[PDB]
Design an enzyme around this catalytic site. Structure first.
Site, PDB file in Angstrom:
ATOM      1  N   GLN A 128       0.814  -1.268  -0.148  1.00 52.92           N
ATOM      2  CA  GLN A 128      -0.051  -0.127  -0.135  1.00 52.92           C
ATOM      3  C   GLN A 128       0.793   1.188  -0.006  1.00 52.92           C
ATOM      4  O   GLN A 128       1.016   1.966  -1.046  1.00 52.92           O
ATOM      5  CB  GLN A 128      -0.874  -0.094   1.271  1.00 52.92           C
ATOM      6  CG  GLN A 128      -1.724  -1.117   1.539  1.00 52.92           C
ATOM      7  CD  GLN A 128      -3.199  -0.881   2.214  1.00 52.92           C
ATOM      8  OE1 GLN A 128      -3.760   0.144   1.799  1.00 52.92           O
ATOM      9  NE2 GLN A 128      -3.429  -1.687   3.081  1.00 52.92           N
ATOM     10  N   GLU A 165       5.645  -8.758   1.008  1.00 52.11           N
ATOM     11  CA  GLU A 165       4.101  -8.422   0.427  1.00 52.11           C
ATOM     12  C   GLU A 165       4.099  -7.043  -0.359  1.00 52.11           C
ATOM     13  O   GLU A 165       4.627  -6.323   0.503  1.00 52.11           O
ATOM     14  CB  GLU A 165       3.115  -8.344   1.557  1.00 52.11           C
ATOM     15  CG  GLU A 165       1.767  -8.127   1.024  1.00 52.11           C
ATOM     16  CD  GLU A 165       0.674  -8.089   2.006  1.00 52.11           C
ATOM     17  OE1 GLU A 165      -0.444  -7.626   1.541  1.00 52.11           O
ATOM     18  OE2 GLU A 165       0.992  -8.332   3.286  1.00 52.11           O
ATOM     19  N   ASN A 191      -1.644 -10.984  -0.941  1.00 50.17           N
ATOM     20  CA  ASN A 191      -2.531 -11.326  -0.067  1.00 50.17           C
ATOM     21  C   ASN A 191      -3.953 -11.766  -0.684  1.00 50.17           C
ATOM     22  O   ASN A 191      -4.421 -10.586  -1.229  1.00 50.17           O
ATOM     23  CB  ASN A 191      -2.920 -10.469   1.286  1.00 50.17           C
ATOM     24  CG  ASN A 191      -3.327 -11.172   2.439  1.00 50.17           C
ATOM     25  OD1 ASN A 191      -3.930 -12.242   2.144  1.00 50.17           O
ATOM     26  ND2 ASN A 191      -3.187 -10.366   3.411  1.00 50.17           N
ATOM     27  N   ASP A 244      -4.998 -14.473   5.208  1.00 48.73           N
ATOM     28  CA  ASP A 244      -5.421 -14.068   6.719  1.00 48.73           C
ATOM     29  C   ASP A 244      -6.438 -12.914   6.354  1.00 48.73           C
ATOM     30  O   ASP A 244      -6.571 -12.111   5.406  1.00 48.73           O
ATOM     31  CB  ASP A 244      -4.210 -13.004   7.249  1.00 48.73           C
ATOM     32  CG  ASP A 244      -3.870 -11.962   6.634  1.00 48.73           C
ATOM     33  OD1 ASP A 244      -3.269 -11.927   5.377  1.00 48.73           O
ATOM     34  OD2 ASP A 244      -4.188 -10.662   7.216  1.00 48.73           O
ATOM     35  N   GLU A 245      -7.465 -12.935   7.601  1.00 52.10           N
ATOM     36  CA  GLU A 245      -8.420 -11.608   7.969  1.00 52.10           C
ATOM     37  C   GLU A 245      -9.378 -11.550   6.817  1.00 52.10           C
ATOM     38  O   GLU A 245      -9.741 -10.268   6.541  1.00 52.10           O
ATOM     39  CB  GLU A 245      -7.563 -10.541   8.073  1.00 52.10           C
ATOM     40  CG  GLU A 245      -6.849 -10.665   9.518  1.00 52.10           C
ATOM     41  CD  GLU A 245      -6.204  -9.371   9.902  1.00 52.10           C
ATOM     42  OE1 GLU A 245      -5.970  -8.358   9.147  1.00 52.10           O
ATOM     43  OE2 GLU A 245      -5.820  -9.124  11.204  1.00 52.10           O
ATOM     44  N   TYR A 252       6.340  -8.700  16.089  1.00 48.17           N
ATOM     45  CA  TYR A 252       5.993  -7.735  15.480  1.00 48.17           C
ATOM     46  C   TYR A 252       6.482  -6.270  15.641  1.00 48.17           C
ATOM     47  O   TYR A 252       6.531  -5.804  16.825  1.00 48.17           O
ATOM     48  CB  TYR A 252       4.259  -7.849  15.458  1.00 48.17           C
ATOM     49  CG  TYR A 252       3.497  -8.921  14.674  1.00 48.17           C
ATOM     50  CD1 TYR A 252       4.156  -9.968  13.983  1.00 48.17           C
ATOM     51  CD2 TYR A 252       2.278  -8.616  14.333  1.00 48.17           C
ATOM     52  CE1 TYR A 252       3.502 -10.818  13.454  1.00 48.17           C
ATOM     53  CE2 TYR A 252       1.487  -9.528  13.670  1.00 48.17           C
ATOM     54  CZ  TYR A 252       2.215 -10.638  13.304  1.00 48.17           C
ATOM     55  OH  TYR A 252       1.504 -11.606  12.334  1.00 48.17           O
ATOM     56  N   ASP A 298       0.950  -0.449   8.584  1.00 46.45           N
ATOM     57  CA  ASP A 298      -0.245  -0.041   9.369  1.00 46.45           C
ATOM     58  C   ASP A 298      -0.340   1.588   9.122  1.00 46.45           C
ATOM     59  O   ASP A 298      -0.360   2.228   8.108  1.00 46.45           O
ATOM     60  CB  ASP A 298      -0.482  -0.434  10.680  1.00 46.45           C
ATOM     61  CG  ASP A 298      -0.610  -1.949  10.733  1.00 46.45           C
ATOM     62  OD1 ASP A 298      -1.076  -2.774   9.933  1.00 46.45           O
ATOM     63  OD2 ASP A 298       0.043  -2.535  11.857  1.00 46.45           O
TER      64      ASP A 298
HETATM   65  C1  LIG Z   1      -1.318 -11.701   8.770  1.00 46.04           C
HETATM   66  C2  LIG Z   1      -1.549 -10.322   9.498  1.00 46.04           C
HETATM   67  N1  LIG Z   1      -2.384  -9.676   9.091  1.00 46.04           N
HETATM   68  C3  LIG Z   1      -2.551  -8.266  10.051  1.00 46.04           C
HETATM   69  C4  LIG Z   1      -1.689  -7.445   9.206  1.00 46.04           C
HETATM   70  O1  LIG Z   1      -2.291  -6.887   8.210  1.00 46.04           O
HETATM   71  C5  LIG Z   1      -1.848  -6.650   6.853  1.00 46.04           C
HETATM   72  O2  LIG Z   1      -1.752  -5.495   6.793  1.00 46.04           O
HETATM   73  C6  LIG Z   1      -0.965  -4.538   5.833  1.00 46.04           C
HETATM   74  C7  LIG Z   1      -0.892  -3.064   5.764  1.00 46.04           C
HETATM   75  O3  LIG Z   1      -0.417  -2.766   7.152  1.00 46.04           O
HETATM   76  C8  LIG Z   1      -1.420  -5.282   4.304  1.00 46.04           C
HETATM   77  O4  LIG Z   1      -2.935  -4.760   4.127  1.00 46.04           O
HETATM   78  C9  LIG Z   1      -1.733  -6.763   4.499  1.00 46.04           C
HETATM   79  O5  LIG Z   1      -2.356  -7.458   3.249  1.00 46.04           O
HETATM   80  C10 LIG Z   1      -2.458  -7.290   5.714  1.00 46.04           C
HETATM   81  O6  LIG Z   1      -2.220  -8.702   5.555  1.00 46.04           O
HETATM   82  C11 LIG Z   1      -1.191  -6.195  10.206  1.00 46.04           C
HETATM   83  O7  LIG Z   1      -0.503  -5.163   9.298  1.00 46.04           O
HETATM   84  C12 LIG Z   1      -0.648  -6.815  11.261  1.00 46.04           C
HETATM   85  C13 LIG Z   1      -0.096  -5.537  12.158  1.00 46.04           C
HETATM   86  O8  LIG Z   1      -0.651  -4.561  12.934  1.00 46.04           O
HETATM   87  O9  LIG Z   1      -1.306  -7.362  12.193  1.00 46.04           O
HETATM   88  C14 LIG Z   1      -1.775  -8.819  11.132  1.00 46.04           C
HETATM   89  S1  LIG Z   1      -0.685  -9.921  11.081  1.00 46.04           S
END
Ligand SMILES: CC1=N[C@@H]2[C@@H](O[C@@H]3O[C@H](CO)[C@H](O)[C@H](O)[C@H]3O)[C@H](O)[C@@H](CO)O[C@@H]2S1
Length: 633
Positions: free
Chosen positions: A161, A187, A230, A291-292, A390, A438
């Site tokens: 991003q 990524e 992702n 994830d997520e 992390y 983030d």
């Molecule tokens: C795997 C984990 N997923 C979240 C992770 O999310 C990622 O966020 C970044 C942007 O910061 C990208 O969008 C990725 O696609 C996404 O997977 C978080 O960044 C992380 C730390 O806050 O926590 C979990 S670990």
């Protein structure tokens, strides 16, 4: 008076040495050193000697040592003497050294480095460089063999991003190489160039040429760069301009973060991206994330996936079966390209009609899911990607505390939430730290680099040596600071121009200037307009992660922020870091100006730059705006 005077030992081997002469530390530590008689000193005349095949490694180590020690060290072939560092590749020592280990012998034949592979020899030279760059050129005699306990050791680097500059990635790869770290999960978006995918060429992206360059650098340093795209969640940066591939909920509301896995064109779009990446990454793995996907919601709001599941995988199949079947279909796809798939462990869901394929590597971060011991029992291959390792620029829950982990006996078997498994599990691949952006204006990338220092050494020590030879973390800290960074980092010209007053013709649309430049503690500049008294900021435009990603966004003058303070000043972060500029000297002598947070480059807009963002808003032709370097070079 004391008559204090430098010892000044003759170069080469000495049969006399004091019994307790310091052995300079390394990271990872080289455990089980056996002491010999005497000592060896690098000095005038010392060479790095090797076979023709190892010449590039020897020339590189000789130029590096020349720079750290102030002694002219040349590479040579043929016979070595006691004055020399010798490099040997002996492929028959795989049992003792494996694919990455090395032996040092320091004695009357000089300093020998032996590896069973080219990367093995290269890794032994990294310890030679660390031991000789601490101000001591005499090393105690003796011998040590060492090899890493785990096969995969490194970092997730989400260059996602927002953009992490390729200069920063180059440094990071040099640091990884110094610490014998061999794995980076990157990524990132490789700029899509074809017809069904080109509308996703929004920033951040990396060009094919720039990826080929840093993958080449990584591979020479023994580092596997694994790409991640992702899916099927966290897809905003890919699906924003492809709403036809987005998953709609039961009321018709689409989420740009969600791939519709029941739409075969959406699945084809993801496979097309894997084919695009295949041409530039050399690795044998593909990481699809997983994830997520349903973060912020639930599969109950997506009845379409249950209907899909029942058609595709039979009566009683559930949305978790459709989700799992998408992962298994991507597995089938990448295996046919000779790759092995990897996912995050929250992709492991409770299934009914489908079972997740056990040939998928599981990178475990989320200990609320199926527990580490259950996956051990299931027989999955696991990597430890605990949240304890992390960092995030914004989520202060995620800042690695290396002192705590060193003192609390964490090891590679200590999965998320302190859940211990057998550290000798035969399918435990290793462990990694994770570097997440983030909300990205709180910290510049150069502040991230300062902050991750100690944690990178921590993970290097625990995945190679799995030992704590320093009595406390503070003893470790003192040595890793004395070892310091590798040469490439020390040589990087963060701030190539002096602070002072400059004419800057490219900024004439903003002010006639001149401009006062001052440097910041993190290697950037603030640029004050001496006409208005305000400072140049890249502040306004469409954002991802609260940073302006918009191609063609224009900078503006704003009241001057205090750029001298550190990242703990979170309340003024955005005004401060939007006023930071990175200046680079090209090949050669000409300067480019980039916003520190966006890593695009200022340029005079021509109207001919081609990018999806510019289809819908272009800056006025002839004004100064930011663009990816590829559109303006
Ligand atoms: C795997 C984990 N997923 C979240 C992770 O999310 C990622 O966020 C970044 C942007 O910061 C990208 O969008 C990725 O696609 C996404 O997977 C978080 O960044 C992380 C730390 O806050 O926590 C979990 S670990």
């Amino acid at each position: 008076s004391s008559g204090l005077v430098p010892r000044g030992s003759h170069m080469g081997y000495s049969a006399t040495a004091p019994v307790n002469l310091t052995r300079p530390a390394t990271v990872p530590s080289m455990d089980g050193w056996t002491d010999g008689t005497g000592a060896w000193t690098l000095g005038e005349g010392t060479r790095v000697v090797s076979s023709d095949a190892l010449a590039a490694r020897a020339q590189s180590l000789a130029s590096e040592l020349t720079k750290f020690t102030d002694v002219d060290i040349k590479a040579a072939t043929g016979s070595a003497t006691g004055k020399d560092i010798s490099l040997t590749l002996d492929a028959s020592k795989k049992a003792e050294l494996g694919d990455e280990g090395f032996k040092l012998n320091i004695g009357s034949k000089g300093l020998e480095v032996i590896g069973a592979t080219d990367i093995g020899v290269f890794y032994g030279t990294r310890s030679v460089s660390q031991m000789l760059r601490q101000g001591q050129l005499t090393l105690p005699a003796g011998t040590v063999a060492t090899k890493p306990k785990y096969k995969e050791r490194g970092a997730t680097l989400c260059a996602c991003q927002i953009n992490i500059s390729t200069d920063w990635i180059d440094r990071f790869l040099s640091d990884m190489a110094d610490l014998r770290l061999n794995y980076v999960l990157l990524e990132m978006k490789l700029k899509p160039e074809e017809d069904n995918t080109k509308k996703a060429a929004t920033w951040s992206y990396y060009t094919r040429d720039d990826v080929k360059k840093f993958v080449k650098k990584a591979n020479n340093y023994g580092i596997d760069v694994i790409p991640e795209i992702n899916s099927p969640g966290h897809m905003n940066v890919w699906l924003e301009n492809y709403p036809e591939y987005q998953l709609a909920d039961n009321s018709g509301r689409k989420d740009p973060n969600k791939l519709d896995i029941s739409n075969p064109e959406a699945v084809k779009f993801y496979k097309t991206l894997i084919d695009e990446y295949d041409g530039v990454f050399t690795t044998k793995y593909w990481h699809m994330g997983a994830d997520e996907y349903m973060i912020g919601t639930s599969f109950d709001n997506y009845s379409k996936l249950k209907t899909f599941a029942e058609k595709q995988y039979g009566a009683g199949a559930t949305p978790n079966d459709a989700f799992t079947g998408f992962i298994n279909d991507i597995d089938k796809y990448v295996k046919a390209k000779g790759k092995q798939l990897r996912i995050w462990n929250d992709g492991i869901v409770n299934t009914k009609n489908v079972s997740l394929n056990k040939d998928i590597v599981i990178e475990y971060w989320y200990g609320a899911g199926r527990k580490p011991q259950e996956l051990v029992q299931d027989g999955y291959t696991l990597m430890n990607a605990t949240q304890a390792l992390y960092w995030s620029r914004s989520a202060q829950v995620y800042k690695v505390n290396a002192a705590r982990l060193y003192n609390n006996n964490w090891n590679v078997g200590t999965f998320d939430g302190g859940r211990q498994i057998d550290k000798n599990y035969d399918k435990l691949t290793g462990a990694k730290v994770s570097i997440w952006p983030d909300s990205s204006y709180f910290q510049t990338e150069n502040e991230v680099e300062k902050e991750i220092f100690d944690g990178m050494r921590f993970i290097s020590q625990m995945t190679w040596s799995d030992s704590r030879p320093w009595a406390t973390w503070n003893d470790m800290k003192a040595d890793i600071d004395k070892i310091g960074y590798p040469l490439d980092i020390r040589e990087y010209d963060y701030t190539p121009v002096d602070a002072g007053i400059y004419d800057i013709p490219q900024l004439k649309s903003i002010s006639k200037g001149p401009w006062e430049l001052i440097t910041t503690p993190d290697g950037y500049y603030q640029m004050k307009d001496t006409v208005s008294g305000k400072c140049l900021a890249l502040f306004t435009g469409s954002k991802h992660l609260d940073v302006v990603t918009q191609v063609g966004a224009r900078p503006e003058l704003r009241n001057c922020a205090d750029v001298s303070v550190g990242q703990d000043q979170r309340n003024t972060a955005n005004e401060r870091n939007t006023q930071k500029w990175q200046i680079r000297a090209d090949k050669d002598g000409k300067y480019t100006i980039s916003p520190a947070l966006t890593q695009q480059r200022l340029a005079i807009a021509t109207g001919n730059e081609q990018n999806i963002d510019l289809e819908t808003h272009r800056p006025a032709a002839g004004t100064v705006a930011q663009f990816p370097a590829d559109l303006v070079s």
